[PDB]
Amino acid sequence: ASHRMRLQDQGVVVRLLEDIPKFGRKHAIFRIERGRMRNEWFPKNKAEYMTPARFQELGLTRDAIGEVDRSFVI
Amino acid sequence: RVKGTGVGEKVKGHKHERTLVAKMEKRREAMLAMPDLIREWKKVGKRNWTKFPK
């Protein structure tokens, strides 16, 4: 324990445009690693970045981000 | 409306001023117990004394 620690990134918020197995159902919002989204999902159009503008158009707020569901089954 | 001297504000007072009444009381308490402390020190003696500040 300490009063200051190493600064870390928690990930990027994305809304799945498909239904990837082992992560979440379609239209699911959660924080995923930047590597997977940047190299695997975004090119294949499997998800999209949830920018502040996107939150407004979709009517949701920043308090709708969920968690990854590793147990998810198709 | 500045801090302390503003309307409805109260001066905080310097640290040595806040603990002024709590400082003279400690000194007053020690003197009242001075005769009883010297009596126990002259009876017990300098060598057998075992109470010292910390």
Binding site: - | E17, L20, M24, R28, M34, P35, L37, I38, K42
Partner: protein, 56 residues
Amino acid sequence: LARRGTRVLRLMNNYSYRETNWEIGRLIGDPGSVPGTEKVGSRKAKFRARRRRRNT
């Protein structure tokens, strides 16, 4: 009891009332001797008590 219980608060600096340290010193007794060093009992009185305790 009245002397040691009295508190004279004197006007000082910056409109501050406090007990002067020297007055706090004279509460136990007047200057000239160190209170506590003076023998409370008298050797003669101690001799009388010694006989009383032996008589009984």
